Structure formats: C-alpha cells, structure tokens
Amino acid sequence: DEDETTALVCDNGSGLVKAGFAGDDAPRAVFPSIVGRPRHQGVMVGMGQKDSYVGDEAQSKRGILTLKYPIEHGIITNWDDMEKIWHHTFYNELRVAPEEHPTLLTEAPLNPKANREKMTQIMFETFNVPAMYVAIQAVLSLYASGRTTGIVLDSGDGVTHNVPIYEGYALPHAIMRLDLAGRDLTDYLMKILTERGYSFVTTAEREIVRDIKEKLCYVALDFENEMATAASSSSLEKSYELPDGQVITIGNERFRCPETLFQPSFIGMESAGIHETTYNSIMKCDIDIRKDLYANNVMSGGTTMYPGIADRMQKEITALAPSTMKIKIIAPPERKYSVWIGGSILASLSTFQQMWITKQEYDEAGPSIVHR
C-alpha cells in the first residue's frame, strides 16, 4: 500500500495535463497546460496579489494575464513555467505532498535525452519525490490496449505521431511526427464556420467553436460522396444552440474539419496525412515485423475521437497495404486517456516496483540513471 495507493501518474500534454493515482480508472485531474501572468497590478475581491495563475484560473481570467504554453508540440520548452504546472498538480489539484509519493511521468516520442535528465533533476531535487519513472506516451497507450507490438497513431492538442513499438521498444528510426492536431483543427473549423456566414466575435463565441468540433464533428468515410450528399441536402445538417438562443447551423463543415487530418492541403500544409504517414512508418520498419504493425494500429489521443476515424483509416491503409495483409485499426472508447490509463496499470503493477528510479539511485548515479 506504501506505494500501491501512493503512485502518481502525470501525463503532461500540449493542451491538457491528465493526473491522478495509479490504480484509478481515469485521471483525477484534467486541466489546461497554461500559466498566466497578470498584465496589470490589482486584486480579486478577498484575495491577495497573485503572481501567477495555472490551469483553469488562467483560462477564466485570460483577459488580464499573458497566457503561456510550457509544452510546445509535446516537448517542454519552458522549465520555469513547467515546474509551476507540476506544483499546481501536486499541491492543489491532487492535494498530495509529493515527498512521499512515487511519480510516473510521461514524455514524448523523440524527447531529447537532456530533457528526460532535466525533469528528473526537478522531480528529485526541487519536489523531493521518493522515486519516479518516465514512460514514452505511445508506449503507454499500446500497453493499455493489452499489447506490446503495434503502431500507435497518437494525436492530441499540438502533435501527431506514429510510434511503431516491438516487444515494448519504440522504434526510433520509424517514428513520424506531424505538427497538426486538435488546436489547428479548432482554428480551421472557426474559419469554415465564419465562412458559412458567421461571427465568433466575443471570447464566449471563440471558446465554444471548440465544443462544436468535439460534439458535432465527424470523419466520414467516402468524404467524396459526402460533399455530394451535402448538396442534395439531406437531414445531414446539425444546429447547435449557443451560450444564448442564437442557434447556429452546421451541416456540411461538420466533416470538412477532420478531412483536414487526411488532407493537410486544406490548411496550407504540404506534409503528408495521417494514413499515409501510418503507412510510411510501416515501410520504414523491418520487413518481418510489418504484418504485426498492420494488424495493430492502436489509436490514442483527443483528436482521434472524431467518430468514423477508424473506418476511414481502416480503408485508407487496406488500400495502400499489399492484399496479402491483415489490417486492424484498434480505437478504444477511453482513448482520450489511453496514455494515462497505460501508466496507471503499469505503475500499479506488481512487477514495476523494480524499475522505479529511487533517490538512492539518483543521489548516487546523477540524472543519467533514469535517462537509460
């Protein structure tokens, strides 16, 4: 129990932090990855002067603060502001003292060696956690779907990745990163919806375009004869009621937004798209392992939640793969937390105890120890 209860799992994202206790089924804490700094001197009624704001209080009060994102494209870019988000996570969100809890953290696919050593330096030397561990994100997603070999298409708020994993070892030279994700996708909907003849003028109009994207957006299979369908004008249309009455209608654009993930050309991106990239990762891997990867395309991440994403991907890679092959696109329902759940499982596991980096290992080996 000492640490059975006690292991923490913190998944640091570009848009959201997911956090909680190893053992739980879902994150106890989910909140924006921002750190707000007040543009002016003054106070809220009853509070003192605050130097900084994190998560939702930074979002809610955004009009008087300069908002900053510590993690650009999955990589920690500002370490002063990240230590601020961690502090908030332990002390306010989970309300635990960190110096008696083992902490499993996550990093990104080709996270620079030096960063994995730096967050270890900050975990052990400024938070004084007993022990910690850094798992790679795609690797926890895979594992949370039971398996050990597969290829994960991972897509969240600032990055998309393909991480081919074989008997647990993520394959460095076959990993692909596509910098277009849910953030890019909300801003494109924004324009095709103002372009539908609308105005997201106040900040209460801006924010909810993102809630339109999440609730009403679709990834149609045969996106071709779906536009064609749009035109005959079926009961395909969908009206959402705004903060007030102002019933906005979205028929068609509803799927023009996730067609951006297959066609980056919709947004002036010259890069290849999700399905081709799944494939290219795969023809960059060893030959003998390619049947395995093909029958185990595990999807994880908030942006892979658009319904019919899996069917489109299913047919997208069948028709690029040699017919002798079995294609299989696994997309679980909890996928917006796969990464986290994979960490919860792993860290609560009976056999993981012997991989925890302890302060004994650290004080004796330097940050190098956990770096592997």
């Binding site: 050990t148 596991l349 009976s350 056999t351 105890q353």
Partner: protein
C-alpha cells in the same frame, strides 16, 4: 544465544543466523524479484504465462544463485523454476499465475 555467552562470560562471536536466508527472501520480495515480475506483467494486457516466464529468467537466471531451472524428473510433473529455500529445493510450475 548471544545473551548467554554474555551472561556467562564466554567468548563466542557469531553472525546472525537469519542472514543465511536473506538471499532467498530478497529474490522473492525485492523489486526486481519474482513477485514484481509477476505483478508487473499482470499489467500487460497481452502477456502470457510464457511471457512472464521469460522475464523471470532473462533477469534472474545465471545472475542469481537461489534461482535455478528445474529438474523436470523424479516425482515432479513439469518444468519452470526451482528455488532454494532453507528446507530445500522447490520446483515451481507457473501456469495460471497471471
């Protein structure tokens, strides 16, 4: 014991008798020991008894003395791993464990 030799005044030095067993215990209860490997694999949605087995070896075999590969014959029924407990050698079958 040591109290007597202290009470009487005899001059006898000796090491804790427990110590002899610490070897076996660590192998079971310590972090990269049996249980752990056992309880980790339990987290792998697609692990096998066989999987577990290998993990057990790759990590303890040859490197650990109390750890041994079975003697499959005598009155025993199959092979997986023997341990060297104080009472003797126990031949363990790993099947269903996971």
């Amino acid at each position: 014991e040591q109290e007597e030799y202290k009470k009487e005044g005899i001059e006898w030095e000796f090491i804790d008798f427990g110590m002899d067993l610490a070897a076996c215990i660590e192998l079971i209860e310590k972090p990269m020991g049996i249980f752990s490997i056992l309880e980790e694999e339990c987290m792998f949605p697609k692990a096998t008894d066989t999987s577990f087995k290998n993990k057990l070896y790759d990590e303890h075999l040859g490197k650990s003395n109390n750890f041994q590969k079975p003697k499959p014959a005598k009155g025993k029924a199959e092979a997986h791993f023997s341990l060297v407990h104080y009472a003797g050698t126990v031949d363990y079958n790993i099947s269903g464990w996971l």
